Amino acid sequence: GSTVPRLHRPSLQHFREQFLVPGRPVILKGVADHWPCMQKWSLEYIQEIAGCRTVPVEVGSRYTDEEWSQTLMTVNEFISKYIVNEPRDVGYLAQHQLFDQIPELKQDISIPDYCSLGDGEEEEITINAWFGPQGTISPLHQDPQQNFLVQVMGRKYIRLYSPQESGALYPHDTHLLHNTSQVDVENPDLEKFPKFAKAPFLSCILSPGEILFIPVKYWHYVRALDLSFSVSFWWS
Ligand SMILES: CNC(=N)NCCC[C@H](N)C(=O)O
Ligand SMILES: O=C(O)CCC(=O)C(=O)O
Ligand SMILES: [Zn+2]
Numbered sequence: 001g002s003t004v005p006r007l008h009r010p011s012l013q014h015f016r017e018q019f020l021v022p023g024r025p026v027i028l029k030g031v032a033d034h035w036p037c038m039q040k041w042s043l044e045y046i047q048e049i050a051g052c053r054t055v056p057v058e059v060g061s062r063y064t065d066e067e068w069s070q071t072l073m074t075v076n077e078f079i080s081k082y083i084v085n086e087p088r089d090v091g092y093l094a095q096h097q098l099f100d101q102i103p104e105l106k107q108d109i110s111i112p113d114y115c116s117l118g119d120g121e122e123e124e125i126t127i128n129a130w131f132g133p134q135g136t137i138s139p140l141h142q143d144p145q146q147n148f149l150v151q152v153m154g155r156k157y158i159r160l161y162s163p164q165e166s167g168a169l170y171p172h173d174t175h176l177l178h179n180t181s182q183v184d185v186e187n188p189d190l191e192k193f194p195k196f197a198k199a200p201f202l203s204c205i206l207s208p209g210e211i212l213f214i215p216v217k218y219w220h221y222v223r224a225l226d227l228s229f230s231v232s233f234w235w236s
Contacts, residue, residue: 005026009028012113028148028211028212037152041153041229049102049105051076053075058070059092062184082133083132090136092130092136093130111125115148126233127231127232131229134228136223140159140221142220143214146234146236147213148214149206149212150212151210151211155225155228156224157222158204160202161218163218166219168195169196
C-alpha cells in the first residue's frame with residue numbers, strides 16, 4: 001500500500017471533514033512536537049519521577065502467544081530487567097494509565113485540540129502509556145474508540161487495515177478476542193489465511209513528535225524499532 005499522510009497542524013475543520021468523519025488515518029506534524037515530554041523524557045527522568053511506582057508488565061513477544069503473561073513490578077525493575085540489562089524476554093509496560101497514577105507525568109503532555117471535535121467529555125478520555133524496549137509487538141487488533149497515538153521516544157513501524165477488510169483479517173472466534181486478528185502481519189500463514197494477502201493497507205514509521213490518528217475500529221499493528229515510549233489518547 002501507501003504511506004499514511006502527514007499534515008502540519010491542520011485546522012480543526014480540515015481534520016474533521018477529511019479524516020474524522022470519513023474515518024481516514026493521518027499523521028499530524030507540528031502538534032505534539034514541543035510538548036515538554038519530547039525533550040524531558042528519558043530513562044533517567046522516568047526513573048527519577050516514576051521508578052518507585054508499581055506498574056503492570058506484559059511478558060512475551062505477542063499477547064496472542066500461549067506462553068504470554070502479565071505481572072507486576074516497579075518502573076525501575078522494568079527498565080532494569082527488560083531494557084538495559086540484556087533482556088532475556090520481551091517485557092512491555094503497555095496500556096497502563098500511567099498518568100492517572102503519576103499526575104506529575106501528565107504535566108508533560110496535553111489533550112490534543114482535535115479531541116473536542118467528538119461527543120465525549122475531556123476527562124472521560126483514556127490516556128495510556130506504552131513503554132518498552134526495541135522489538136515489542138502489538139498484534140493486529142481494533143479498538144472501540146478514536147485514537148491519537150503520540151510518539152515520544154524511539155520509532156514504531158505501524159500497519160493499518162480498514163474495518164472493511166475485516167474479513168481478510170480472520171478475527172478470533174471467541175468474543176473475548178474477536179477484536180484481535182489471527183494473522184501474524186509480518187509473517188502471515190497464507191496457507192491458513194489466504195485472503196490476508198490481497199487486503200490493501202496503509203503503513204508508516206512513526207517518529208518522535210508525530211501523532212498517529214487511528215480512526216475508531218481501524219485495525220492497527222505496532223512494532224517498536226527502538227527503545228520506544230508512546231502515549232495513546234482514546235476519545236469519542
Ligand atoms: C497493544 N499491545 C499490547 N501488548 N497490549 C494491550 C492489548 C490489549 C488491547 N486489546 C489493545 O490492543 O488495546
Ligand atoms: O503502540 C502499541 O504497541 C499499540 C498501541 C495501541 O494498540 C493503541 O494505542 O490503541
Ligand atoms: Zn490499540
